[PDB]
Amino acid sequence: TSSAKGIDYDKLIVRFGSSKIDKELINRIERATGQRPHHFLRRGIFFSHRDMNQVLDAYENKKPFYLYTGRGPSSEAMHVGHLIPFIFTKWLQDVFNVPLVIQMTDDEKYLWKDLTLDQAYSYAVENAKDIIACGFDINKTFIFSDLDYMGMSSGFYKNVVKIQKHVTFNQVKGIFGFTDSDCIGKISFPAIQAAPSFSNSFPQIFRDRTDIQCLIPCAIDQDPYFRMTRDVAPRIGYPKPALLHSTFFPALQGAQTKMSASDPNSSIFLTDTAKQIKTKVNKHAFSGGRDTIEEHRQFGGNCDVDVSFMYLTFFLEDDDKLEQIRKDYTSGAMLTGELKKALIEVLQPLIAEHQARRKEVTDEIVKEFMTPRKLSFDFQH
């Protein structure tokens, strides 16, 4: 919350009622897939879950399940922090090889921000290109805009209504903190976000089928929506969706805040130039190192609060190379200046690569991803 080393996610798990992703669960995931678990799991980035056990049972018993995650398109400007969940979702889809549903809440943002319907919709379609740039299989993923899809689904709105009937205003005032002063749109929005947790909201993909297990990978701050969804699921004859939580991507200023596009000073946008990335890291990445280089060589740095090192934790694939850096920074063998330099050498190509991928997705490609249709996945209807 205010700790320089970030939030206490063990306390968070507790006051959230979720369960920790332990060694046991990570080994099971490895066993079930025969693949080495993604570094987000190995390193505690995706630290919490809800019913991942069930998802695994289903997967091992050849039962089907699908992925569902989303994005609030509040702007054309996305940052590196926004990529975490998507990066992991793309891994989950390749590893388990299941269909994916990605909700673009353009209506949410229209409701909450000073935006035009076309703006909101435009940001959804633009952000979709960035999501497509993460590598999702065009034949296994449906990226939809709430504004468009609501009007071209024989089952989506039906579920929204079912959910709306089972969630009182008091409940959402408690869960999300709404007040008598908010517009009725905001008050009923949670149902829109919950609805995609149920397979029959996507007839063109699951056609009336209502049992497919849903797995929702998302940043921990989205949990309240699905904590609510899980309570209503049984009440309306549907299965509870499973969750896989991720920690907040640290703001440049320090781990006590998540990177927020609101404050561009804390973000590294996917549209920043190599130069801008370098100067943002060098000038703004909070350092766990010592004040003078002499003191650094003598006492060493503190990785637990160093933002530059935390970023490496998310983007440096190689486990061994990261460890050297950790040890060398801690022993003072590596100066924060060199740590910084190392991070910049990881992000510049990360972001430049992403821009290259994004430039590749043409109007025709986006349109297809956003067209409801069968996802070359056969279900025992």
Ligand X SMILES: N[C@@H](Cc1c[nH]c2ccccc12)C(=O)O
147 touches a second copy by CB under 8 A: yes
Binding site partner of 110, from a second copy, ligand X, none, Cβ cut-off 5-8 A by kind: a second copy
Residue 117 touches a second copy, criterion: CB under 8 A? yes
The yes or no reply on residue 216 touching ligand X (CB under 6 A) is yes
| Closest-CA residue to 373 (of 114, 45, 170, 149) | 149
The CB-of-54 to ligand X minimum distance in angstroms stands at 18
Figure out which of the listed residues 119, 159, 200, 222 binds ligand X, where binding follows CB under 6 A. Answer: 222
Nearer of residues 81 and 332 to ligand X, judged by Cβ: 81
48-76 burial, b for 16+ CB within 10 Å, e for fewer?
bbbbbebbbebbeeeebbbbbbbbbbbbe
CB closer to a second copy out of 181 and 380: 181
218 lies in the site for ligand X, by CB under 6 A: yes
**C-alpha dihedral over 130, 90, 101, 23, to 10 degrees?**
-140
For ligand X, the closer of residues 6 and 70 by Cβ is 70
Least Cα distance to 105 among 31, 37, 185 occurs for: 185
Between CA 220 and CA 196 the distance in angstroms is 18
C-alpha–C-alpha distance, residues 226 and 195, integer Å: 10
Nearest partner of 339 among 294, 290, 372, judged by Cα: 290
Site string for a second copy, 149-168 (x = CB under 8 A): -xxxxxxxxx--xx-xxxxx
State the minimum distance, in angstroms, from the CB of residue 196 to a second copy. 14
Contacting ligand X within 18-77 (CB under 6 A): 69-72
Q: Is 170 in the site for a second copy (CB under 8 A)?
A: yes
Bridge partner list, 66: 214
For the bound state, the minimum distance from the C-beta of residue 301 to a second copy, rounded and expressed in Å, comes to: 49
Structure tokens at 364: 């025709």
Tokens representing residue 267 in the block: 């973000």
Site size for a second copy, by CB under 8 A?
A: 37
Sequence-distant (6+) residues with CB within 8 A of 174 are none
Check residue 358 for interaction with a second copy (CB under 8 A). Answer: no
Asked if residue 59 lies in contact with residue 32, where contact means CB atoms within 8 angstroms, the answer is yes
- Look at residue 380 and give the partner it binds from ligand X, a second copy, none, a contact being a CB closer than 5 to 8 Å depending on partner kind: none
Number of chain residues interacting with ligand X (CB under 6 A): 11
Q: What is the distance between the alpha carbons of residues 39 and 24, in angstroms, rounded to a whole number?
A: 16
| d(C-alpha 44, C-alpha 248), whole Å | 11
Contact yes or no for 103/70 (Cβ under 8 A): yes
Of these, 18, 48, 105, 188, which contacts ligand X (CB under 6 A)? 105
Least Å from the CB of residue 108 to ligand X: 6
Binding to a second copy (CB under 8 A): which residues in 184-213? 184-185, 187-188, 190-191
CB of 196 to ligand X, least distance (A): 7
Q: State how far the Cα of 299 lies from the Cα of 294, in Å rounded to an integer.
A: 9
Q: Residue 234 interacts with a second copy (CB under 8 A)?
A: no
Cβ of residue 157: shortest distance to ligand X, in angstroms?
16
| 141, 193, 200, 266: residue in contact with ligand X (rule CB under 6 A) | 193
Q: Sheet containing 48-50: which strands, arranged edge to edge?
A: 19-20, 48-50, 242-246, 213-219, 65-71, 100-104, 141-145
Q: Which is nearer to ligand X, 223 or 306 (CB)?
A: 223
**117 touches, from ligand X, a second copy, none (C-beta below 5 to 8 Å by class):** a second copy
Q: Which one-letter DSSP state was computed for residue 258?
A: E
- The distance of closest approach from Cβ of residue 73 to ligand X in the complex, given in angstroms and rounded to an integer, is 8
- Residue 93 interacts with ligand X (CB under 6 A)? no
Return residues touching ligand X (CB under 6 A). 69-72, 103, 105, 108, 193, 216, 218, 222
